[PDB]
């Protein structure tokens, strides 16, 4: 995250590390969106341009963390994957279309001050909260800079952005299943998403239950917060139809 | 279910310090 | 790493 600030304890308890077993480092972001599931990127997992492909007993979840490095003792909880579930319409080829993936645990995590799941939106409140200038929170241990690392969680707020000034900044296609937020250059203020905030959650906090739901992933972007550039995000209420039907499926 | 209510702050009746930066912003 | 050691049962 590019000019964050520390997250508050407890700001944000469906907030996920993905860890490498070995060499025992970060990977990505992700978020709880229960006690046995966990949903991030795609690319965290599978992208094969950088050989990555990674399976379920070569990583680990760490929930309930604060500090990045730190193994925080009697706080965090880590998980063992069950299985992986990679959207089968996943784009790594061409523009990371549908960059959204499921992973199940081989147990039920135990929730706590500091353990929680998020929501996951339903169409109305997706219809209320998803239009431009509309701010949501991203969240992660990613790079502080594009060209160091956070000793804990951040956090920064951002305005979801129009869809033709999206498709302007770029010469990616972007599709329906994604969207992207940040300050313009006029607006003044800045922060993006960067490399390794990748899975991790665009929340936005209802004003009719005042309930947090994730709207987003974060998916990807062209350097980190370039004036005229904007982060892109998993639209999740888009592809909340193949989150569902893989739960259902696979309980 | 109680998804998104969290226990150090809404379950409590506490704030975060920007959470009303995006309540403003719900034009 | 820059990381602390994890338990080892995990
Ligand atoms: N500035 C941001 N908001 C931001 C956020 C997250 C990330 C991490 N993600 C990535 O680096 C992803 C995965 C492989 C290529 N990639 C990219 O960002 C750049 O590659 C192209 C984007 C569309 C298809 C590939 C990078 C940047
Ligand atoms: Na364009
Ligand atoms: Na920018």
Redesign the pocket.
Same mark, same amino acid.
């Given at each position: 995250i590019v000019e964050g600030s520390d997250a508050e304890i407890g700001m944000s308890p469906w907030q996920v590390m993905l860890f490498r077993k070995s060499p025992q480092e970060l990977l990505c972001g992700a978020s709880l969106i229960s006690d046995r599931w966990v949903l991030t990127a795609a690319?965290c997992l599978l992208?094969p341009p950088?050989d990555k492909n990674f399976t379920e007993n070569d990583l680990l979840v760490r929930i309930g963390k604060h500090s990045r490095t730190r193994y925080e003792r009697n706080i965090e909880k880590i998980s063992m994957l069950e299985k992986i579930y990679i959207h089968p319409r996943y784009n790594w080829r #061409?523009?990371?279309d549908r960059d959204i993936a499921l992973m199940k645990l081989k147990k039920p995590v135990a929730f706590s001050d500091y353990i929680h799941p998020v929501c996951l939106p339903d169409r109305e409140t997706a219809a209320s909260l998803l239009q431009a200038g509309y701010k949501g929170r991203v969240t992660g241990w990613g790079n502080l800079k594009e060209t160091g690392q956070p000793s804990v969680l951040q956090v920064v707020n951002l305005p979801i952005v129009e869809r033709p000034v999206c498709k302007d900044s770029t010469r990616?296609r972007i599709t329906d299943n994604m969207f992207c937020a940040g300050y313009k250059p006029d607006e003044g203020k800045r922060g $993006?998403?960067?490399?390794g $905030?990748?899975g991790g959650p665009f929340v936005m906090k209802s004003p009719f239950n005042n309930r947090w739901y994730q709207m987003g992933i974060?998916?990807? =972007? #062209? =350097?980190? $917060?370039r004036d005229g550039k904007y =982060?892109?995000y998993t639209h999740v209420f888009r592809l909340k139809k193949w989150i569902q039907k893989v739960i259902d499926q696979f309980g | 279910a109680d998804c998104g209510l969290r226990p150090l702050f809404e379950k409590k009746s506490l704030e975060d310090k920007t959470e009303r930066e995006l309540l403003e912003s719900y034009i | 790493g820059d990381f602390e050691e994890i338990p080892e049962e995990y």
């Open positions: 690319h992208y950088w #061409e523009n990371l990616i $993006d998403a960067c490399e $905030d990748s974060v998916s990807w =972007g #062209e =350097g980190c $917060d =982060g892109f | - | -």
